[PDB]
Scaffold this active site. Sequence first.
Site, PDB file in Angstrom:
ATOM      1  N   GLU A   4      -8.726   1.702   9.457  1.00 13.72           N
ATOM      2  CA  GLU A   4      -9.171   1.407   8.068  1.00 13.72           C
ATOM      3  C   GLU A   4      -9.036  -0.098   7.835  1.00 13.72           C
ATOM      4  O   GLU A   4      -9.895  -0.764   7.205  1.00 13.72           O
ATOM      5  CB  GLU A   4      -8.355   2.209   7.093  1.00 13.72           C
ATOM      6  CG  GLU A   4      -8.975   2.519   5.716  1.00 13.72           C
ATOM      7  CD  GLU A   4      -9.100   1.251   4.872  1.00 13.72           C
ATOM      8  OE1 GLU A   4      -8.011   0.604   4.881  1.00 13.72           O
ATOM      9  OE2 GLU A   4     -10.180   0.948   4.308  1.00 13.72           O
ATOM     10  N   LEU A   6       0.865  -1.205   0.000  1.00 14.36           N
ATOM     11  CA  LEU A   6       0.000   0.000   0.000  1.00 14.36           C
ATOM     12  C   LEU A   6       0.899   1.253   0.000  1.00 14.36           C
ATOM     13  O   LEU A   6       2.016   1.235   0.505  1.00 14.36           O
ATOM     14  CB  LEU A   6      -0.850  -0.068   1.256  1.00 14.36           C
ATOM     15  CG  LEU A   6      -1.798  -1.246   1.422  1.00 14.36           C
ATOM     16  CD1 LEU A   6      -2.734  -0.916   2.597  1.00 14.36           C
ATOM     17  CD2 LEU A   6      -2.607  -1.451   0.151  1.00 14.36           C
TER      18      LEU A   6
HETATM   19  N1  LIG Z   1      -5.579  -0.342  -1.792  1.00 13.83           N
HETATM   20  C1  LIG Z   1      -5.955  -1.605  -1.696  1.00 13.83           C
HETATM   21  S1  LIG Z   1      -7.251  -1.926  -0.800  1.00 13.83           S
HETATM   22  C2  LIG Z   1      -5.326  -2.727  -2.391  1.00 13.83           C
HETATM   23  C3  LIG Z   1      -6.186  -3.998  -2.651  1.00 13.83           C
HETATM   24  C4  LIG Z   1      -5.371  -4.978  -3.476  1.00 13.83           C
HETATM   25  C5  LIG Z   1      -4.133  -4.753  -3.861  1.00 13.83           C
HETATM   26  N2  LIG Z   1      -3.414  -3.605  -3.536  1.00 13.83           N
HETATM   27  C6  LIG Z   1      -2.012  -3.485  -4.104  1.00 13.83           C
HETATM   28  O1  LIG Z   1      -1.837  -3.543  -5.543  1.00 13.83           O
HETATM   29  C7  LIG Z   1      -0.656  -4.339  -5.853  1.00 13.83           C
HETATM   30  C8  LIG Z   1      -1.261  -5.706  -6.282  1.00 13.83           C
HETATM   31  O2  LIG Z   1      -2.171  -5.319  -7.343  1.00 13.83           O
HETATM   32  P1  LIG Z   1      -1.901  -5.584  -8.935  1.00 13.83           P
HETATM   33  O3  LIG Z   1      -2.966  -4.883  -9.623  1.00 13.83           O
HETATM   34  O4  LIG Z   1      -0.609  -5.134  -9.325  1.00 13.83           O
HETATM   35  O5  LIG Z   1      -1.962  -7.174  -8.984  1.00 13.83           O
HETATM   36  P2  LIG Z   1      -2.986  -8.337  -8.854  1.00 13.83           P
HETATM   37  O6  LIG Z   1      -4.286  -8.082  -9.499  1.00 13.83           O
HETATM   38  O7  LIG Z   1      -3.121  -8.587  -7.363  1.00 13.83           O
HETATM   39  O8  LIG Z   1      -2.113  -9.584  -9.488  1.00 13.83           O
HETATM   40  C9  LIG Z   1      -2.048  -9.715 -10.935  1.00 13.83           C
HETATM   41  C10 LIG Z   1      -2.019 -11.133 -11.404  1.00 13.83           C
HETATM   42  O9  LIG Z   1      -2.927 -11.756 -11.022  1.00 13.83           O
HETATM   43  C11 LIG Z   1      -3.563 -12.609 -12.009  1.00 13.83           C
HETATM   44  N3  LIG Z   1      -4.819 -12.002 -12.475  1.00 13.83           N
HETATM   45  C12 LIG Z   1      -5.153 -10.714 -12.254  1.00 13.83           C
HETATM   46  N4  LIG Z   1      -6.356 -10.462 -12.739  1.00 13.83           N
HETATM   47  C13 LIG Z   1      -6.693 -11.731 -13.359  1.00 13.83           C
HETATM   48  C14 LIG Z   1      -7.938 -12.293 -14.103  1.00 13.83           C
HETATM   49  N5  LIG Z   1      -9.031 -11.543 -14.382  1.00 13.83           N
HETATM   50  N6  LIG Z   1      -7.937 -13.578 -14.486  1.00 13.83           N
HETATM   51  C15 LIG Z   1      -6.823 -14.258 -14.151  1.00 13.83           C
HETATM   52  N7  LIG Z   1      -5.722 -13.919 -13.485  1.00 13.83           N
HETATM   53  C16 LIG Z   1      -5.725 -12.611 -13.138  1.00 13.83           C
HETATM   54  C17 LIG Z   1      -2.514 -12.654 -13.079  1.00 13.83           C
HETATM   55  O10 LIG Z   1      -1.559 -13.572 -12.583  1.00 13.83           O
HETATM   56  P3  LIG Z   1      -0.618 -14.370 -13.598  1.00 13.83           P
HETATM   57  O11 LIG Z   1       0.373 -13.391 -14.137  1.00 13.83           O
HETATM   58  O12 LIG Z   1      -0.034 -15.541 -12.841  1.00 13.83           O
HETATM   59  O13 LIG Z   1      -1.634 -14.803 -14.615  1.00 13.83           O
HETATM   60  C18 LIG Z   1      -1.970 -11.195 -12.971  1.00 13.83           C
HETATM   61  O14 LIG Z   1      -0.488 -11.194 -13.292  1.00 13.83           O
HETATM   62  C19 LIG Z   1       0.155  -4.382  -4.469  1.00 13.83           C
HETATM   63  O15 LIG Z   1       0.915  -3.132  -4.363  1.00 13.83           O
HETATM   64  C20 LIG Z   1      -1.023  -4.407  -3.476  1.00 13.83           C
HETATM   65  O16 LIG Z   1      -0.542  -3.841  -2.232  1.00 13.83           O
HETATM   66  C21 LIG Z   1      -4.073  -2.586  -2.833  1.00 13.83           C
HETATM   67  C1  LIG Z   2      -6.462  -8.004   0.578  1.00 13.22           C
HETATM   68  C2  LIG Z   2      -5.125  -7.303   0.657  1.00 13.22           C
HETATM   69  O1  LIG Z   2      -4.662  -7.188   2.065  1.00 13.22           O
HETATM   70  C3  LIG Z   2      -5.369  -5.943   0.112  1.00 13.22           C
HETATM   71  O2  LIG Z   2      -4.233  -5.189  -0.129  1.00 13.22           O
HETATM   72  C4  LIG Z   2      -6.527  -5.070   0.479  1.00 13.22           C
HETATM   73  N1  LIG Z   2      -6.340  -4.099   1.443  1.00 13.22           N
HETATM   74  C5  LIG Z   2      -7.381  -3.300   1.791  1.00 13.22           C
HETATM   75  C6  LIG Z   2      -8.602  -3.497   1.160  1.00 13.22           C
HETATM   76  N2  LIG Z   2      -9.722  -2.749   1.432  1.00 13.22           N
HETATM   77  C7  LIG Z   2      -9.544  -1.736   2.413  1.00 13.22           C
HETATM   78  N3  LIG Z   2     -10.633  -0.964   2.714  1.00 13.22           N
HETATM   79  N4  LIG Z   2      -8.337  -1.613   3.022  1.00 13.22           N
HETATM   80  C8  LIG Z   2      -7.177  -2.327   2.822  1.00 13.22           C
HETATM   81  O3  LIG Z   2      -6.072  -2.176   3.456  1.00 13.22           O
HETATM   82  N5  LIG Z   2      -8.812  -4.411   0.190  1.00 13.22           N
HETATM   83  C9  LIG Z   2      -7.792  -5.127  -0.083  1.00 13.22           C
END
Ligand SMILES: NC(=S)c1ccc[n+]([C@@H]2O[C@H](COP(=O)([O-])OP(=O)(O)OC[C@H]3O[C@@H](n4cnc5c(N)ncnc54)[C@H](OP(=O)(O)O)[C@@H]3O)[C@@H](O)[C@H]2O)c1
Ligand SMILES: C[C@H](O)[C@H](O)C1=Nc2c(nc(N)[nH]c2=O)NC1
Length: 186
Positions: free
Chosen positions: A30, A22
């Site tokens: 939160e 994050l």
């Molecule tokens: N603010 C909040 S609440 C929050 C919530 C979630 C995540 N995050 C953050 O965002 C980052 C992770 O997010 P991201 O967007 O980069 O990655 P993700 O969506 O978590 O991971 C991507 C991978 O997941 C698989 N994937 C994703 N969507 C897919 C679908 N529709 N069908 C099949 N496989 C799918 C694929 O894996 P393969 O390459 O193996 O196919 C793709 O490479 C981290 O920094 C995390 O902290 C924040």
């Molecule tokens: C599920 C994983 O811990 C992820 O990064 C998420 N964090 C958060 C989330 N949703 C909220 N409101 N806050 C978080 O910190 N959804 C997903």
Amino acid sequence: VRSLNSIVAVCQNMGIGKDGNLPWPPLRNEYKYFQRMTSTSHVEGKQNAVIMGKKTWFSIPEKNRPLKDRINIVLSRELKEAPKGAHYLSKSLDDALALLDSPELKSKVDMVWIVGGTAVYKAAMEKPINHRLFVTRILHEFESDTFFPEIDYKDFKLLTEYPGVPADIQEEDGIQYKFEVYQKSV
Ligand SMILES: NC(=S)c1ccc[n+]([C@@H]2O[C@H](COP(=O)([O-])OP(=O)(O)OC[C@H]3O[C@@H](n4cnc5c(N)ncnc54)[C@H](OP(=O)(O)O)[C@@H]3O)[C@@H](O)[C@H]2O)c1
Ligand SMILES: C[C@H](O)[C@H](O)C1=Nc2c(nc(N)[nH]c2=O)NC1
Ligand SMILES: [Ca+2]
């Protein structure tokens, strides 16, 4: 499935992550909100399902996996088997949706929560199904490398109130944020 729920925290620039984590330091309240919303089923004998991308899954400290009291489903086009600790692995959201409907699961599951990342949120957003989006708006900007997709304000109507969701601007660690609920009716 009847309807989807998505939950996310975003900053002013719509960033949701940076360097595999994050963009902001820890916010206790939160976090508890996310735990509470994702874990709370409204039916005895049932649990909620959380769906998430590969990156997201690996972002959770290993000892914290899987998210306690929920069925963890990870999406990946590359993995052969569910990562150590996850309940199920699926190759697309559709697949994940079908699994949920499966007999074994169907009766075990209450709510389905989408917990990101980007591609995951997007995919869920496009399904022509009833969907509630729980957004925490952190009223500051942080450097981010990952962003929340654009929501169709024509489909997703902001609710002015929702049961159990504080209305006012919240503050913690000198940071302000607000909870908002958007709802899409199909
Ligand atoms: N603010 C909040 S609440 C929050 C919530 C979630 C995540 N995050 C953050 O965002 C980052 C992770 O997010 P991201 O967007 O980069 O990655 P993700 O969506 O978590 O991971 C991507 C991978 O997941 C698989 N994937 C994703 N969507 C897919 C679908 N529709 N069908 C099949 N496989 C799918 C694929 O894996 P393969 O390459 O193996 O196919 C793709 O490479 C981290 O920094 C995390 O902290 C924040
Ligand atoms: C599920 C994983 O811990 C992820 O990064 C998420 N964090 C958060 C989330 N949703 C909220 N409101 N806050 C978080 O910190 N959804 C997903
Ligand atoms: Ca890949």
